[PDB]
Design an enzyme around this catalytic site. Structure first.
Site, short mmCIF file in Angstrom:
data_model
loop_
_atom_site.label_atom_id
_atom_site.label_comp_id
_atom_site.label_asym_id
_atom_site.label_seq_id
_atom_site.Cartn_x
_atom_site.Cartn_y
_atom_site.Cartn_z
N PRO A 9 77.13 70.67 -10.22
CA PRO A 9 78.31 70.96 -9.39
C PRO A 9 78.09 71.38 -7.93
CG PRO A 9 78.00 72.55 -11.21
CD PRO A 9 76.69 71.90 -10.89
N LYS A 64 76.60 75.28 -16.13
CA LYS A 64 75.42 74.64 -15.57
C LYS A 64 74.51 75.71 -15.00
CE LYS A 64 77.35 70.33 -15.52
NZ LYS A 64 77.22 69.40 -16.66
N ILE A 109 79.34 66.62 -12.50
CA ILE A 109 79.08 65.56 -13.46
C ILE A 109 79.61 66.09 -14.79
CG2 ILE A 109 77.39 64.03 -14.52
CD1 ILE A 109 75.56 64.57 -12.07
N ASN A 123 90.43 70.03 -4.63
CA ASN A 123 90.23 68.70 -5.22
C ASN A 123 89.08 68.69 -6.21
OD1 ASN A 123 92.12 66.94 -3.99
ND2 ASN A 123 91.02 67.22 -2.07
C1 LIG Z 1 99.75 67.17 -1.03
C2 LIG Z 1 98.34 67.12 -1.47
C3 LIG Z 1 97.49 68.11 -1.03
C4 LIG Z 1 96.18 68.14 -1.42
C5 LIG Z 1 95.72 67.17 -2.26
C6 LIG Z 1 94.33 67.19 -2.65
F1 LIG Z 1 94.14 66.49 -3.76
F2 LIG Z 1 93.56 66.71 -1.71
F3 LIG Z 1 93.89 68.42 -2.86
C7 LIG Z 1 96.55 66.14 -2.71
C8 LIG Z 1 97.88 66.13 -2.32
C9 LIG Z 1 100.70 67.27 -2.20
C10 LIG Z 1 101.08 68.51 -2.69
C11 LIG Z 1 101.96 68.57 -3.78
C12 LIG Z 1 102.43 67.44 -4.39
C13 LIG Z 1 102.05 66.20 -3.94
C14 LIG Z 1 101.17 66.12 -2.85
O1 LIG Z 1 100.81 64.86 -2.45
O2 LIG Z 1 103.26 67.76 -5.43
C15 LIG Z 1 103.32 69.18 -5.45
O3 LIG Z 1 102.46 69.69 -4.38
C1 LIG Z 2 76.02 69.82 -9.70
C2 LIG Z 2 76.51 68.77 -8.77
C3 LIG Z 2 76.13 68.83 -7.44
C4 LIG Z 2 76.56 67.86 -6.55
C5 LIG Z 2 77.37 66.81 -6.97
C6 LIG Z 2 77.82 65.79 -5.99
F1 LIG Z 2 78.11 64.64 -6.56
F2 LIG Z 2 78.90 66.17 -5.35
F3 LIG Z 2 76.91 65.53 -5.07
C7 LIG Z 2 77.74 66.74 -8.31
C8 LIG Z 2 77.31 67.71 -9.20
C9 LIG Z 2 75.26 69.24 -10.85
C10 LIG Z 2 73.88 69.07 -10.71
C11 LIG Z 2 73.14 68.54 -11.77
C12 LIG Z 2 73.76 68.15 -12.92
C13 LIG Z 2 75.14 68.28 -13.09
C14 LIG Z 2 75.89 68.82 -12.04
O1 LIG Z 2 77.25 68.96 -12.18
O2 LIG Z 2 72.83 67.66 -13.78
C15 LIG Z 2 71.58 67.66 -13.08
O3 LIG Z 2 71.78 68.33 -11.80
#
Ligand SMILES: *[C@H](c1ccc(C(F)(F)F)cc1)c1cc2c(cc1O)OCO2
Ligand SMILES: *[C@H](c1ccc(C(F)(F)F)cc1)c1cc2c(cc1O)OCO2
Ligand SMILES: *[C@H](c1ccc(C(F)(F)F)cc1)c1cc2c(cc1O)OCO2
EC number: 5.3.2.1
Lengths: 114, 114, 114
Positions: free
Chosen positions: C1, C32, C64, C97
């Site tokens: 992560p 993790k 992951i 996100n």
């Molecule tokens: C806007 C919105 C903000 C952030 C994201 C993120 F995924 F990048 F985090 C996506 C969408 C949004 C907020 C809401 C909604 C729809 C949208 O598109 O319904 C309730 O609050």
């Molecule tokens: C953590 C992790 C770090 C970075 C990402 C990236 F895709 F955003 F780059 C995703 C996951 C992680 C590291 C590991 C693992 C699982 C996770 O979730 O298994 C081996 O090292």
């Protein structure tokens, strides 16, 4: 929706009210209330586009729905227009990544949407 | 393609030529003209990797195609090599997110690539 | 992560120990080992949330696996809690996100995790 702009344009060239305009125009374009819209502008970045350090921008639009073929063309016209008009960045030196988010993958207010 | 590096290495340790080097090397690796390539380096970041504050990098590569199991394994060698040499970052302190973008979800020049 | 926070809260309001606290809490939440965990905090950002420049945060958690409906709710409570207590950001001014990454699309140390 959430819109992020990263650009090599300096901070002083970002006009007063720019974030407000993005908020307002994105509300109009997405049909989402202004209260939902997040906007983030990151000037003075170390970046290049086609190996040139002339003004450019790398952007993202994340939205729960309201993403698709025609919609994204429309967002690009709107957003490139704004970056051109307000930040003096040529539209052909802008990339915008569009992401259609699942509601379950968006966190807000101690929880997630659905 | 678009490549972004976020790092805790300070700005003065990023060589002036690094964006252009990345552009050229990524053009060869992806088979795309250098003109298509955008690069973005963000130094002086507050980050930790495995609970340590030693030099590290969190990166992304977005591309319309040219992303997959074997290709990604190859990119990681290329990019770790560049970051190790130019930014003095140990390769086990680098993460790279690879994203295969649909052309309809990449905005450029008032439209999208669809 | 990997966890990233972008916020308009100033650098001085980020407590010493915040990155370590995030690393430890994410290790517990994801299951993790802390050695795998990357954390990145970006203060002093020019952003707005709902048209307002009061404290807010835009965040991402890439993992992951360990991503899904109920797990994302738990992460949001955890992370909004931390942002409220440590950075004084109200939970309803935070977006997070969540991305479930394919191991083939995560580069690390000259390869991927596939
Ligand atoms: C806007 C919105 C903000 C952030 C994201 C993120 F995924 F990048 F985090 C996506 C969408 C949004 C907020 C809401 C909604 C729809 C949208 O598109 O319904 C309730 O609050
Ligand atoms: C953590 C992790 C770090 C970075 C990402 C990236 F895709 F955003 F780059 C995703 C996951 C992680 C590291 C590991 C693992 C699982 C996770 O979730 O298994 C081996 O090292
Ligand atoms: C490069 C490219 C740049 C940016 C992205 C984005 F989605 F992250 F914004 C994706 C890919 C590129 C440019 C092209 C092209 C292919 C690629 O990969 O075909 C025409 O222009």
């Amino acid at each position: 929706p959430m819109f992020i702009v990263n650009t090599n344009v300096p901070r002083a060239s970002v006009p007063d009210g720019f974030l407000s305009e993005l908020t307002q125009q994105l509300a109009q374009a997405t049909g989402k209330p202004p209260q939902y819209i997040a906007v983030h502008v990151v000037p003075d970045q170390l970046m290049a586009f086609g190996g040139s350090s002339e003004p450019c921008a790398l952007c993202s639009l994340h939205s729960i729905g309201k993403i698709g073929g025609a919609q994204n063309r429309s967002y690009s016209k709107l957003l490139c227009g704004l970056l051109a008009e307000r930040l003096r960045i040529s539209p052909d030196r802008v990339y915008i990544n569009y992401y259609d988010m699942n509601a379950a993958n968006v966190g807000w207010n101690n929880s997630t949407f659905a």
